[PDB]
Ligand binder design. Structure first.
Ligand code: E3A
Ligand code: E3A
Lengths: 280, 283
């Protein structure tokens, strides 16, 4: 019924496309964060489509309108494999077009790992508060063994839900988040918590070989992805073209923050992609 | 006899200004053909002078900005004992004097600051002294991160006490630019004097205290392999400044003088400044 793709595990992934009227100048894959879905990138995608980019996305397995037990994954690499499947199909239909990646939170870790798996393949990456660092209190050998032990008996045990007020200072956007039926607001399950720790460990190992151009957007008051991880990404990535923008006092969901922040975010992505699309 | 530059040119033959201490500062102007859209002050680094910003200034003048500069006291064609200053604030006071004179002649125009190394610390302190006054600041490897006090009282018995001259190869990976640096007679290549090193430590301490009140928009350009201004200081400036509009660009493997680095770096530096100032000049 709906636009979709069938992944290597035989699971249906819901697909979304924002095709410009004329010939596309470039392709851009949108990778959403944990618990959310591709429908939340409607405004960003419309802005990008207005630059003559063909925007495409899928809801990651266990998210939005895609199949899978909610916010569970056999191995974090499944997300990367599925992005590469979708990118490869699009590129076959649009040969020679440059391909960009845009990712938020966990979607940002997926984008990093996707570009690290295919060096020199992506024209650029836009990262909005990417998941790159674990809280040191949750990554100790003791806490990892405790989580692994707990995983054996109660893999679906919830770590408790977050206070949705840490997502954005924009109260209306918090209320939109809280009433979207496609968002999973249930607490992080132990088994998925371990997969996010695998994602952070894999990101850290990938940075010395990451050469893709990137734009990194980060809020200074983000309680989910600490701003210190954005500074470490700027320092450790080997990319020759890297830009960081810090939004003072902003929370996690920068593209759904206070209008002053959101307008700047859209403008900065517009300018950065536009400058690297003319280059093609 | 008429007052002359340290290189014996009468100041009456050159654009100049006289600072609050009665010292002549050599001035430089790059005025666009038509009506200027904005003003931009260029603040040079320690040991160098305003003549090294010729190319950057021509690019900015091409955006219809009126570019202006002076050689800091004790530098280039200005007066004063070489690379010595009574207090670091003298540099800030003199920038404000020049900015205030230009603004009187061009009322209502937005004013930007562009600074490299010590010139960047001057730009930060200048904007911190006048909140909401400057439209923006472009910083190229600014000086933000650091018992020579014994040597300060030992600079009463040994005034010329210096730290070793730096290895010019550390400034840029571009060998031609290193050779240009080494043969410019207006550059002071002598090692950093202890009394001046203390003033640079005062600058860094004052920059740290100014950051919680710094709100000016800024663009920060920094090389990852800079041995003079460690890249760590650029990350700390991004974190501690209260500015709502702040952008950092890191040049992987680049040295200190980014605007005179390898062509791939220099071309990006010029382009990024062009785009950043242009977007804030349209306003
Ligand atoms: C920029 O204008 N610079 C002047 C030359 C290079 C950077 C060096 C410099 C600036 C500040 N300091 C300094 C030295 C020691 C110390 F403990 C603090 C500051 N050196
Ligand atoms: C992005 O999609 N992210 C950002 C980061 C995980 C997914 C989210 C995060 C950080 C900390 N926690 C968390 C969840 C539940 C809990 F009880 C305590 C911390 N989720």
């Amino acid at each position: 019924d709906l636009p979709h793709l069938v992944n290597a595990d035989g699971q249906y992934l819901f697909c979304r496309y924002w095709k410009p009227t004329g010939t596309p100048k470039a392709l851009i894959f949108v990778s959403h964060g944990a618990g959310e879905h591709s429908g939340r990138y409607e405004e960003l995608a419309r802005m990008l489509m207005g630059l003559d980019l063909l925007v495409f996305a899928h809801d990651h397995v266990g998210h939005g309108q895609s199949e899978g037990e909610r916010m569970v994954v056999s191995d974090f690499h499944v997300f990367v494999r599925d992005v590469l499947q979708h990118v490869d199909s699009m590129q076959k239909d649009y040969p020679g077009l440059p391909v960009f990646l845009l990712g938020h939170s966990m979607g940002g870790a997926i984008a990093i790992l996707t570009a690290a798996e295919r060096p020199g393949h992506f024209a650029g990456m836009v990262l909005i508060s990417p998941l790159v660092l674990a809280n040191p209190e949750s990554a100790t050998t003791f806490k990892v063994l405790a989580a692994k032990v707990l995983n054996l008996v109660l893999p679906n045990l919830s770590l408790g839900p977050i206070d949705s007020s840490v997502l954005s200072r924009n109260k209306t956007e918090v209320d939109i988040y809280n009433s979207d039926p496609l968002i999973c607001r249930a607490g992080l399950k132990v088994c998925f918590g371990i997969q996010l720790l695998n994602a952070v460990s894999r990101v850290e190992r990938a940075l010395p070989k990451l050469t893709v151009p990137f734009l990194l957007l980060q809020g200074s008051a983000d309680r989910l992805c600490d701003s210190k991880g954005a500074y470490l990404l700027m320092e450790l990535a080997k990319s020759q073209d890297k830009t960081l923008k810090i939004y003072e006092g902003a929370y996690h969901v920068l593209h759904k923050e206070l209008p002053e922040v959101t307008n700047s975010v859209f403008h900065e992505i517009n300018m950065w992609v536009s400058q690297r699309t003319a280059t093609a």
